[PDB]
Design a protein around this nucleic acid. Structure first.
Ligand SMILES: [Mg+2]
Ligand SMILES: [Mg+2]
Ligand SMILES: [Mg+2]
Ligand SMILES: [Mg+2]
Ligand SMILES: [Mg+2]
Ligand SMILES: [Mg+2]
Ligand SMILES: [Mg+2]
Lengths: 40, 100, 94, 59, 166, 149, 140, 75, 102, 286
RNA sequence: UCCCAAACAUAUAACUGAACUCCUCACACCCAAUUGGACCAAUCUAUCACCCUAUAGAAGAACUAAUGUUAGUAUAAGUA
RNA sequence: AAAUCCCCUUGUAAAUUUAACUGUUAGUCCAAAGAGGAACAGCUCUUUGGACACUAGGAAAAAACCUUGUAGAGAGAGUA
């Protein structure tokens, strides 16, 4: 749902394709240390 | 004047956008029932020489009429009021897991 | 009532079938997609003469790696330590 | 809502009586909006294994 | 073979302190290798199951089935050693706890049929088991009343949760 | 299958980690044979790693008993009373270390089907839904098709 | 050297234990039990696909029920939230409806407000400016 | 047509692949034009350099932007 | 996965996060934060300076055995496999917000 | 007869497991079981709790008066030297006195409007027999407890738990013990209602006096919502109005039970123990 | 043999929909006949091991099915 | 007539030869071109392609019609 609108706006049809919602790291250490990169 | 939804039953919903437009603010305070929309609580419902004791009004009923009375008072069917055999009575879990 | 002679989808008297609205909508949107494909395939960047032999060097080197990989098959080296490591199966504390 | 456990569950799984006036109405449209109420399909907490159906009265 | 029922009368419990109540007397008795069908004897065992010893004797005395007199003697001798050897004060203060029949050892004989055929018949033998407990028979379970149905239905309605969610 | 295996809800032990984290592993007992190929992996494990593992986890008591046996075993006990027994019959050293480390992180609860991948004692903050949540109230709350006075 | 199987009792017990809760002779006879245990194992493996499908359908039903209480349709609510760059899946939307009625009502208001904005934009010829909630945040 | 799809490396569906716009490639593409979607390549930032080779991202609209920051546009 | 979390609750991740048990981390991807009277939404994500949520690892265990069986009638096709998926349990400790709306 | 040994050996273990399950042995103390070392176990006890306990205080914390008497009886029968062990009676009183004060102080800051009687009951509930026993069992306190019989009685188990708290208080101090009790005793009232921890009779009766104290008029009850009144499954939403202003709403199957629930809801809001209240702060202070 | 889902012309085109694809993680782990491999229960022997195992050699070396053979017990049936 | 054979570039990674043998060639259905004394169908038989005897979804139930394959867990999502 909403894929066609996403394609018009210039984003991926699948919201999980590319963008901050998936590309950005999900977690980081409490003190502020960045987490290691994920395999995906 | 405009309202996306009529705010009269659950909560008044206000929608706003941040200065940068990257966040949506929704302030939804709850509503209360007005005093004028309630009914009062229904409080209202001789030469006696003998004490009026609690009399046994529990009359025995056959399986037929007793099930019929249960079905009409609970608006259900007659099937669920019949007993089950030992096979099903033993497969039931007397110690189910508990959550929340 | 309502028997169909023979099978439903094969035979002389089959079950009649009709198209739907979304069945058409799917066909046109597929037809439009190829219309895009037909247009974008009509503007080659170069001609056959210009392209002739512009990738021959990379193709040849790729095949030489394929030849080298195929001709390098041989039994692996056999060492003495791995054959001697089986002596450890009887190792025990003093 | 600071409700006790038993009253909170009781209110959530309660039964609501609905009334419908069928005068000059198509039976199917009447039956359409009555099926959801009877099955409890209008409840956000609906589930098939849960007896969440409601009462429907049609005049 | 197995003869555990006979040994059940040889188990001895430790002496009881005055704080705990009286342990009711129990007697295990059984008769082996009875020329009877275990299925047929099952009906008599179920009939006298849960009743008093003397009521069971009265019911068995006037029963026309052959197995009735066999159980009647078994109940009689079970009552005898109960008072005599099992410290039972009143011989009529006994009720049947469990009565059942088990398959005994059976022989295989040939039953002749026509056209030279045959069928293997079986001489059925069975055992009868009985346990007597001192004291009046427990009252039978009363029928479940309508109010009992009412509260149970309420409990089911109150025990339902929102499923497949938090 | 799930219908043939008991299940339980997701939970912890005494709200572990809410204020502080308490290691759920409490005791480890190792059975090792001096002679025998089945205990070679167990033997070399305690030569080089059981010392370092003990220092890493100070709240866990480790017992190493050396007796003749055909199958080396490790027994793990938790504060909730659960007991886990794992055989060390003919395994290597890098894989017993992973096996031993796994028992340390476990909370001791039964490893069975979990009904819900989430658990909370307060599923709602604004109140659970009820049939009157989205129902307006009329004047004096008159019922449908009724009159007053 | 004559060899005979000595652990057949354990070989059949590993199958009979999975059928202990069945009904009939197929819970104790190995010949019958092996045929139904295989079917039970196969059904369990393929039931995982059905669980994912059925759970989504349950969420859609609950979302539709809550939306209809707010005078909204499920297609209208789902599409408008996507146009608002609010990427909430069906589970959390159902979770919000059941447990956070006021938050869900705000989301329904947002969808309806967005729906009216799109209608006005389509009503115009494009000369009019964009809607307040129709603006999209660009990411580079 | 199966072999042609094999040659162009189009095994997994919905997986974009770049190809040279030359008559030889065009000839192969014309056979399976009913199974694929063809779009041109746009390079608004030009051909990527070695420094930014890890920062490229092929957006859904058909261009390969060499600067991927995962940050909202300040405009 | 999208989780509706609050304070003092447990959620199960069907994976290993390569973290020591007891360590506390931060979850930077927050799509919605709501309260009794107000609710804030991200487009599609909230700013890092607006909301902060932290969780603590409390369990790293394996899953119960799962049966993967495949059978085809009259073809002698029967295969069985048993797998256990590593999982991690996290307890959400606190959810904090800051007055950075302006 | 089939030649072989492994199959018979495996079968013997299976039968013994069935024999064990048929009549499980009575529970025995973990100390009497093999693989035990009191010095080693009590050393890891402090490290497991991330605390620096005192060996002498901790060792005598688990000693009970009943255990001392049993040992004196055992040596008297053997006719045999004198023990110098000290019971944990004084340590338990120190732990109990501090825990009651610390719990009372902690709840007063969190709920300033909580009445004193409500404060006492919650502390009584937290220091109740079952709460400490449940915590002690899950903290392996009973395993190290030196008693005369197994399992340890709840009264003895509770005394032992308060003893180690006093031992920690002497070894570490009030500031460290305050964090300890918060981490293991405060956490026992997470998902429980105020009246689920403080049993009360007549919620409306003291609701009137509470509004009397706040200089507010008496609440009146009115029927906000009703459903199925004449049936066997009714629902009544009774709300309380003061000066024609709603303060609380309460559901119930009958009018009477709905009114009591409305009173309970009002008391929770008045005392600040609502489900919407902010969660307890377990973060280390700055 | 007994029609056959129940229904509904009027609230702005999206939405629903696979084991296809994407996301976290892990990947030898869904074809007949046939072929190529990786392992392995149980038993004997050589040497170990000593609450039942290890490395090798050997073989009467593994049964949901042949109206399969022998033995036991059910079904019809407490029926003829 | 549709089309084939041959075939540099290019896209690609396969192909030929040597050694060693087992197993299949009693097939079905659909689209198309045909043949069976100058038979519109039907019956039988050739040729090209696809599917089936290998997964899943959809046409009501569905071996052969449409969508789709490379294999696991997930209480995610976009689509055919
Ligand atoms: Mg037909
Ligand atoms: Mg004759
Ligand atoms: Mg796939
Ligand atoms: Mg794979
Ligand atoms: Mg053989
Ligand atoms: Mg046979
Ligand atoms: Mg008959």
């Amino acid at each position: 749902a909403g894929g066609q609108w996403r394609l018009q706006q210039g984003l991926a049809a699948n919201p999980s394709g590319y963008g901050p919602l998936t590309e950005l790291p999900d977690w980081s250490y409490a003190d502020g240390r960045p987490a290691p990169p994920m395999k995906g | 004047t405009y309202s996306p939804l009529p705010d009269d039953y659950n909560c008044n919903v206000e929608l706003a956008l941040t200065s940068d437009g990257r966040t949506i603010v929704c302030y939804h305070p709850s509503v209360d029932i007005p005093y004028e929309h309630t009914k009062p609580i229904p409080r209202p419902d001789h030469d006696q020489v003998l004490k009026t004791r609690l009399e046994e009004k529990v009359e025995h009923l056959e399986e037929g009429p007793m099930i019929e009375q249960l079905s009409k008072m609970f608006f259900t069917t007659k099937h669920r009021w019949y007993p089950h055999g030992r096979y099903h009575r033993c497969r039931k879990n007397l110690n189910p897991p508990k959550d929340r | 009532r309502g028997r169909i002679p023979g099978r439903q989808w094969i035979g002389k008297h089959r079950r009649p079938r009709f198209v739907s609205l979304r069945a058409k909508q799917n066909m046109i949107r597929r037809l439009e997609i190829e219309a895009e494909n037909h247009y974008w395939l009509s503007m080659p960047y170069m001609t056959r003469e210009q392209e002739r032999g512009h990738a021959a060097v990379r193709r040849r080197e790729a095949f030489e790696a394929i030849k080298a990989a195929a001709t390098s098959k041989f039994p692996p080296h056999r060492f003495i330590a791995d054959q001697l490591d089986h002596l450890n199966v009887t190792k025990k504390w003093s | 809502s600071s409700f006790s456990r038993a009253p909170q569950q009781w209110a959530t799984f309660a039964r609501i009586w609905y009334l419908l006036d069928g005068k000059m109405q198509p039976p199917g449209k009447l039956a359409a909006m009555a099926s959801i109420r009877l099955q409890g399909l209008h409840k956000p907490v609906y589930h098939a294994l849960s007896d969440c159906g409601d009462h429907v009265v049609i005049m | 073979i197995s003869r555990k029922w006979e040994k059940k009368n040889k188990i001895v419990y430790p002496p009881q302190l005055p704080g705990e109540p009286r342990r009711p007397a129990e007697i295990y008795h059984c008769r082996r290798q009875i020329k009877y069908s275990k299925d047929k004897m099952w009906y008599l065992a179920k009939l006298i199951r849960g009743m008093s010893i003397d009521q069971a004797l009265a019911q068995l005395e006037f029963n026309d089935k052959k197995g009735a007199k066999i159980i009647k003697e078994v109940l009689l001798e079970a009552q005898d050693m109960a008072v005599r050897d099992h410290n039972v004060e009143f011989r009529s203060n006994l009720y049947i706890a469990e009565s059942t029949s088990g398959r005994g050892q059976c022989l295989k004989r040939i039953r002749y049929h026509g056209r030279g055929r045959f069928g293997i018949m079986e001489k059925v033998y069975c055992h009868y088991f009985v346990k007597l407990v001192e004291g009046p028979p427990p009252p039978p379970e009363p029928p479940k009343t309508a109010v009992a149905h009412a509260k149970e239905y309420i409990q089911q309605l109150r025990s339902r949760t929102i499923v497949h969610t938090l | 299958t799930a219908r043939g295996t008991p299940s339980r809800f997701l939970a912890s032990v005494l709200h572990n980690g809410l204020g502080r984290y308490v290691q759920q592993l409490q005791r480890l007992s190792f059975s090792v044979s001096r002679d025998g190929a089945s205990s070679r992996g167990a033997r070399e494990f305690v030569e080089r790693e059981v010392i370092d593992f003990a220092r890493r986890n100070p709240g866990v008591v480790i017992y190493v008993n050396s007796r003749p046996c055909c199958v080396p075993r490790v027994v793990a006990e938790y504060l909730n009373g659960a007991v886990r027994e794992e055989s060390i019959h003919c395994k290597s050293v890098e894989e017993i270390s992973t096996l031993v480390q796994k028992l340390a992180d476990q909370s001791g609860l039964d490893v069975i089907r979990i009904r819900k991948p989430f658990h909370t004692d307060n599923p709602s903050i604004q109140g659970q839904w009820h049939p009157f949540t989205n129902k307006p109230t009329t004047f004096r709350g008159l019922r449908p098709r009724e009159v007053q006075d | 050297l004559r060899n005979r199987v000595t652990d057949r009792y354990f070989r059949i017990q590993e199958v009979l234990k999975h059928a202990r809760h069945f009904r009939g002779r197929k819970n104790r006879c190995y010949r019958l039990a092996v045929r139904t245990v295989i079917r039970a194992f196969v059904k369990c493996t393929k039931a995982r696909y059905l669980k994912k499908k059925n759970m989504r359908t349950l969420w859609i039903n609950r979302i539709t029920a809550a939306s209809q209480e707010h005078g909204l349709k499920y297609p209208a609510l789902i599409g408008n939230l996507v146009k608002c760059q609010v990427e909430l899946n069906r589970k959390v939307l159902a979770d919000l409806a059941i447990y956070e009625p006021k938050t869900f009502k705000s989301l329904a208001a947002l969808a309806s407000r967005r729906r009216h904005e799109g209608f006005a934009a389509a009503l115009g010829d494009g000369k009019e400016p964009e809607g307040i909630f129709s603006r999209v945040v660009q990411y580079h | 047509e199966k072999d042609i799809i094999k040659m162009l490396g189009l095994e997994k569906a919905h997986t974009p692949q770049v190809h040279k716009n030359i008559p030889s490639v065009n000839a192969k593409l014309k056979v399976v034009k009913h199974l694929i979607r063809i779009k041109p390549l746009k390079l608004p930032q030009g051909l990527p350099a070695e420094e930014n080779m890890s920062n490229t991202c092929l957006k859904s609209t058909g261009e390969l932007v060499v600067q991927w920051h995962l940050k909202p546009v300040e405009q | 996965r999208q989780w509706k979390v609050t304070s003092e609750d447990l959620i199960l991740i069907g994976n290993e996060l390569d973290l020591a048990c007891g360590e506390r981390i931060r979850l930077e991807k927050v799509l919605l934060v709501g309260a009794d009277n107000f609710t804030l939404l991200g487009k599609p994500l909230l700013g890092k300076d607006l909301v902060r949520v932290e969780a603590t690892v409390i369990e790293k265990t394996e899953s119960w055995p799962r049966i993967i069986m495949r059978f085809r009638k009259r073809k002698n096709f029967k295969k069985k496999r048993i797998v256990t998926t590593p999982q991690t349990v996290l307890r959400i400790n606190s959810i904090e917000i800051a007055p950075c709306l302006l | 007869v089939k030649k072989g040994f492994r199959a018979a050996f495996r079968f013997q273990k299976e039968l013994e497991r069935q024999r064990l399950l048929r009549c499980p042995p009575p529970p025995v103390r973990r100390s009497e079981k093999p693989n035990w070392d009191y010095h080693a176990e009590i050393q890891a006890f402090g490290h497991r709790l991330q605390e620096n306990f005192s060996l002498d205080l901790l060792k005598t914390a688990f000693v009970n008066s009943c255990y001392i008497k049993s040992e004196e009886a055992k040596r008297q029968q053997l006719g045999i030297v004198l023990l110098n062990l000290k019971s944990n009676q004084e340590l338990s009183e120190q732990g109990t006195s501090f825990s009651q004060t610390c719990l009372t102080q902690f709840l007063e800051d969190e709920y300033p409007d909580m009445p004193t009687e409500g404060i006492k009951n919650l502390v009584d509930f937290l220091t109740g027999e079952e709460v400490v026993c449940h915590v002690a069992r899950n903290l392996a306190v009973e395993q190290l407890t030196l008693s005369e019989e197994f399992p340890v009685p709840p009264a003895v188990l509770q005394q032992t738990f308060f003893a180690v708290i006093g031992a920690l208080l002497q070894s570490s101090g009030p500031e460290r013990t305050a964090l300890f009790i918060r981490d293991f005793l405060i956490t026992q009232m997470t998902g429980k209602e105020l009246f689920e921890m403080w049993k009360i009779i007549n919620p409306m009766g003291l609701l009137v006096e509470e509004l009397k104290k706040r200089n507010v008029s008496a609440p009146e009850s009115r029927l906000t919502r009703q459903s199925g009144g004449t049936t066997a499954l009714p629902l009544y939403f009774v709300g309380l109005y003061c000066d024609k202003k709603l303060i609380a709403e309460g559901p119930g199957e009958t009018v009477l039970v709905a009114e009591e629930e409305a009173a309970r809801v009002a008391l929770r809001k008045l005392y600040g123990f609502t489900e919407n209240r902010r969660p307890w702060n377990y973060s280390k202070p700055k």
